[PDB]
């Protein structure tokens, strides 16, 4: 099975949670109807060169239905420091900063 | 706002490989997905493939082994290559843009056709349809073009370089016994003005770099 | 993968009467289908999306709905321009693969329209060429159906003639015909009265255009 890219704007539902772990969860509503479509999400140091940095802790995220505005949760491992969550593709994606330490 | 452009070879020798190109305005094409579909008279649209640059692609499961992509982002072009043409694959072939976050395509190019065939380029020959009297109804003069003998299709045909667009008709081809293809285009104006205004028929026919003019006057 | 049914093959109506396009699916997919409007010579253009969503440009007359298994396309009043042909399309999720259907072609109803009619002789330049053509033009008529027959000195032609259609006209919604009577220069020259024969609904009888070698 092949997923294309999810290619339409996402929105925060509620503003990104920091977890017991240090990792952040987040819940983004999904405007598009291409699902089922596979999720651009990473962490960047570098917004120019959108550079991985981090870990994504769901494996995989998809869009499993068609269904316009659904919604969905993921789970992101921050690196130190700072960095910015970026979901999404085009001029509408969307970024939230973050700062980590331990 | 997008606008994409078709060019290719116009016609193909059978089995040899099709390449077309397709430049786009309005839209970096390092960003959504972009599509080659194509259409014969004969059986419908037919999506070809598609590409999301630096993600992947996705193919046509019964064209897949005969098609490669490619994107040139600094020149906002990509291409299509098709192997082993054969006469089933004589068509009308488009790019166009996936539709961001949609199951559709929004922009498409005009399309270019494609011929596959082992007959020789040829361009035609632009003879005048003169107005007379035998061409005077409807309170109007009739006045042509006659596009013929050439090969492949197509030729694009305007009038007075694009000014004179009332009453125009260009018909479609037809395909004679010699297997050259021959067409007409015909303006209808008014009689007072075939002594007092200039009729040129403008005809372009790429596969043969044919670019020429016919004034058309009266008769005798 | 998905198989698209449209219906009926054809429409023709008035303008001013409502269309209703039928696309039917294999098996369901998506609830968000695609229309597209055809004219001649031109690309497909995405006409609605998502099913019931105009895309940039629609005029409000076209409207869609459906779901499951079966959408429509509806043009509550027609208009002249509306000629053309209508695609419904649709995504495959696996095999990820874009499906239209094979098309409804909606023509115009008008009232009948009787041709003007021209000929013309060939040009002095295809005759250097060795071969002669000749030229009978029908200009905005309606219906479609004619008969264009040539005849030599009173002889019925076969075989050396071909024929050409317009699309409908975008705006008054009549068709023209071109007919071109093709010999060589040598039996051209061995002949006088070329004749062009028009048959069509609004004329009491078979009409003549022709003209003599020699004007």
Redesign the interface.
């Known amino acids: 099975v092949?997923y294309?890219?999810?290619?339409?704007?996402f929105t925060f539902t509620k503003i990104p949670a920091e977890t017991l772990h240090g990792t952040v969860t987040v819940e983004v509503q999904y405007?598009?109807?291409?699902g089922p479509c596979k999720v651009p999400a990473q962490m960047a140091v570098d917004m120019q060169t959108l550079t991985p940095v981090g870990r994504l802790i769901t494996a995989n995220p998809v869009i499993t239905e068609?269904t316009e505005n659904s919604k969905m949760m993921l789970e992101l491992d921050p690196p130190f420091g700072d960095s910015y969550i970026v979901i999404g593709?085009?001029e509408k994606k969307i970024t939230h900063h973050w700062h980590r330490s331990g | 706002?997008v606008q994409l452009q078709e060019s290719g070879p116009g016609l193909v020798k059978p089995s040899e490989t099709l390449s077309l190109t397709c430049t786009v305005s309005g839209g970096s094409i390092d960003?959504?997905?972009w599509?080659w579909?194509r259409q014969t008279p004969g059986k419908?649209?037919?999506?070809i493939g598609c590409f999301?640059y630096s993600?992947?692609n996705?193919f046509?499961?019964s064209l897949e082994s005969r098609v490669t992509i490619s994107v040139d982002t600094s020149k906002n072009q990509f291409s299509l290559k098709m192997t082993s043409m054969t006469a089933s694959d004589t068509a009308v072939y488009?790019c166009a843009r996936?539709?961001?976050?949609?199951?559709?395509?929004?922009?498409?190019?005009?399309?270019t056709l494609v011929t596959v065939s082992s007959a020789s380029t040829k361009g035609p020959?632009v003879?005048?349809?003169?107005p007379?009297s035998?061409?005077?109804?409807?309170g109007?003069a009739?006045l042509?073009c006659?596009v013929?003998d050439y090969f492949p299709e197509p030729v694009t045909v305007s009038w007075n370089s694009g000014a004179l667009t009332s009453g125009v008709?260009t018909?479609?081809?037809?395909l004679?016994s010699s297997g050259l293809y021959?067409?007409?285009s015909?303006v209808?104006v008014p009689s007072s003005s075939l002594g007092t205004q200039t009729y040129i028929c403008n005809v372009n026919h790429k596969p043969s770099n044919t670019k020429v003019d016919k004034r058309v006057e009266p008769?005798? | 993968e998905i198989v698209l049914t449209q219906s009926p093959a054809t429409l023709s109506l008035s303008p001013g009467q409502r269309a209703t396009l039928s696309c039917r699916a294999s098996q369901s997919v998506?609830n968000?289908?695609?229309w597209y409007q055809q004219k001649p010579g031109?690309?497909?253009?995405?006409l609605i999306?998502?099913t019931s969503k105009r895309?940039?440009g629609t005029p409000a007359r076209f409207s869609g709905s459906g779901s499951g298994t079966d959408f429509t396309l509806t043009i509550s009043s027609l208009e002249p321009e509306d000629f053309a042909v209508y695609?419904c399309?649709?995504?495959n999720n696996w095999?990820?693969?874009?499906?239209?259907?094979?098309?409804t072609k909606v023509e115009i109803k008008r009232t009948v329209a009787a041709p003007?009619?021209?000929?013309?002789?060939?040009?002095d330049?295809?005759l250097k060429?060795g071969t002669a053509?000749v030229?009978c033009?029908l200009?905005?008529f309606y219906p479609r159906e004619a008969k264009v027959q040539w005849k030599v000195d009173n002889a019925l032609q076969s075989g050396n003639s071909?024929?050409?259609?317009?699309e409908q006209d975008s705006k008054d919604s009549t068709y023209?015909?071109?007919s071109?009577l093709?010999l060589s220069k040598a039996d051209y020259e061995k002949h006088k009265v070329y004749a062009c024969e028009v048959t069509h609904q609004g004329l009491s009888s078979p009409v003549t255009?022709?003209?003599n070698r020699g004007?």
């Not at chain 3, 003007?116 to 040009?123: D, L």
């Open positions: 092949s294309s890219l999810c290619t339409a704007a405007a598009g109807t291409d068609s593709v085009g | 706002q960003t959504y997905y599509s579909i419908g649209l037919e999506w999301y993600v992947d996705h046509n499961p488009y996936n539709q961001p976050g949609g199951r559709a395509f929004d922009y498409w190019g005009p399309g020959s003879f005048p349809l003169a007379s035998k061409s005077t109804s409807g109007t009739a042509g006659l013929k008709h018909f479609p081809a037809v004679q021959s067409l007409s015909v209808t008769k005798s | 998506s968000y289908f695609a031109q690309a497909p253009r995405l999306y998502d895309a940039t695609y399309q649709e995504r095999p990820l693969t874009w499906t239209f259907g094979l098309g003007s009619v021209f000929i013309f002789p060939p040009s330049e295809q060429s053509s030229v033009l200009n905005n071909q024929e050409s259609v317009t023209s015909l071109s071109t093709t255009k022709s003209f004007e």
